[PDB]
Amino acid sequence: TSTVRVGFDTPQSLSPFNALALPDYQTARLSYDTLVRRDAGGVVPGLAASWTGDAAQLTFTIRDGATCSDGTEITPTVVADSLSAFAKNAGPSTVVDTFGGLNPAITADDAAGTVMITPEAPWADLLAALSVASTGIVCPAGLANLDGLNTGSVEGAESGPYVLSEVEPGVRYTYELRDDYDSWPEWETTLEGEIPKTIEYTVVKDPSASANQILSGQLDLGRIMPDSRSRFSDSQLVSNPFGNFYLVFNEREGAVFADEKNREAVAQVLDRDAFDQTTTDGTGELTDTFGSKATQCATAAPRPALTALDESAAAETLAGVKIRLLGAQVVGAAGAGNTYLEAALREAGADVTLENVDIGTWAGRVFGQPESYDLTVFPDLNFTGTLTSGISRFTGPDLLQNGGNISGAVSETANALAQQARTATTPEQKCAADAEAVAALVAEHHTVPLLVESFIYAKRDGFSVTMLGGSLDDHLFRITK
């Protein structure tokens, strides 16, 4: 067989420029090729054969013989026009994650075969950010029809290996391997099995339905929740690090958690092992940073000094403190992590009120109404695979002053280390600044790092799936039998 039927959630958009939910990135990865790709320890050549430069400026050499799905040659101009359209059309938050600002210089030299990218100020994450599926190259036909990219294939737009050949919106997305495609990334990791000629990305309603359909043979692979694990043989389960969870506090003047003592006290009631048990049934991994061991700089010194449990001192501090606790229902089954934290704070004598809401409602409150709550567990899907997005929640100007600092925290130390990281002249200078920034934020009780949730694929015999290097949006399906 040359077909894999994969369970996934309904895409919100098939346009890389409008990709917000995981399925949007999953589909973008099939249709459009990024300049570089994640592997263990860093990125590998994708549509770029090589690159020179640093945080201040990158120059990519485009690999020869790459073509759009209509046979159009992928030139530096094609690549530069796609990245310019990305900077222009994508959400401001993802454009800032990619270029450190909204107005990068992006210049093609067709003769030299090069694309030169100069961030407004140095931006060390640019190279890693250009592996994210939403930065995949859209060919001229797609750039001419931005609206049509949202709902299907625009003939000739694809730079990637697959074309969406058939679509039943919200039900099934049928991808067919291009006969003319031969621009595969130069992966360091060797993958067994054959590249599927057809991927049937198949919408599932709920995790329960995903597990049932893999077991009945209606799907070859799909995501399952930890509570369905026991229905499968170990051979059928493939676990990879996915979202990472950490606390965020409202530290604005006049709010309860403006006071460092109240923040330390929350750290004193939040038992990280119990939290992991309630949230993941121990399928997750505790973390002391904003990612897993596979996240860039996550193993670099120093290691944060986490506040030990002290339920006693918490009880003294928190008796009668009013806490607007905000929860996302993705933090454990039915938001079980949020109700664990509510109870832990209630036990210490806080006057706590929990709003446990869906991810959409949660994001509107955290990014749109930052003063409307006091404490949340942030369920981060960090596609970039660096510590930068975690550090950003607590550094620079407040969201209130058009910044990305959602906590309104003021840490002179972490602010300085954030400025050091983005200009870092070497990756190892970058990891030193990022690890010290996390260490300060933990020490000043601006956050508590909690865990990395596992993405558990259940799979039928003769199929495999790999996620390399901590990637979230580069699921490598292979047929072995």
The one-letter code for the residue type at 177 is L
Measure the CA–CA gap between 138 and 88, rounded to whole angstroms: 13
For residue 78, give the amino acid letter: V
Q: How far apart are CA 284 and CA 239, in angstroms?
A: 9
Tell me the backbone φ, ψ of residue 89, rounded to 5 degrees.
-105, -25
Measured from the Cβ of residue 165, the count of other Cβ atoms closer than 10 Å reads: 12
Q: Which residue has the tokens 């939290």?
A: 275
Give the Cα separation of 396 and 405 in Å (integer): 6
Residue 71 contacts residue 139 (beta carbons within 8 Å)? no
Please name which of 58, 143, 51, 145 lies closest in space to residue 104, comparing C-alpha atoms.
58
Residues whose CB is less than 8 angstroms from the CB of residue 291 and which lie 6 or more positions away in sequence, other chains included = 241, 244, 298, 382, 385, 386, 387, 390, 452, 470
Residues β-bridged to residue 208 = none
What is the residue extent of each domain of the chain?
1-242+455-481, 243-454
Question: Is the CB of residue 466 less than 8 Å from the CB of residue 185?
Answer: no
The torsion of the CA quartet 391, 377, 245, 336, rounded to 10 degrees, works out to: 180
* Resolution for this experimental structure (Å): 1.8
Exposed / middle / buried, residue 286 (Cβ in 10 Å: 0-12, 13-18, 19+): middle
Gap between the Cα atoms of 396 and 31, Å rounded: 36
d(CA 454, CA 407): 26
Distance separating alpha carbons of residues 249 and 394, to the nearest angstrom: 9
- 187 CB contacts (<8 Å, ≥6 apart)? 37, 39, 44, 468
Beta bridge partners of 3: 198
Task: Write phi, then psi, for 199 (nearest 5 degrees).
Answer: -115, 115
**Please, are residues 352 and 323 in contact by the beta-carbon 8 Å criterion?**
yes
Tell me phi and psi for residue 24, to 5 degrees. -60, -45
Residue 208 CB neighbours (<10 A): 13
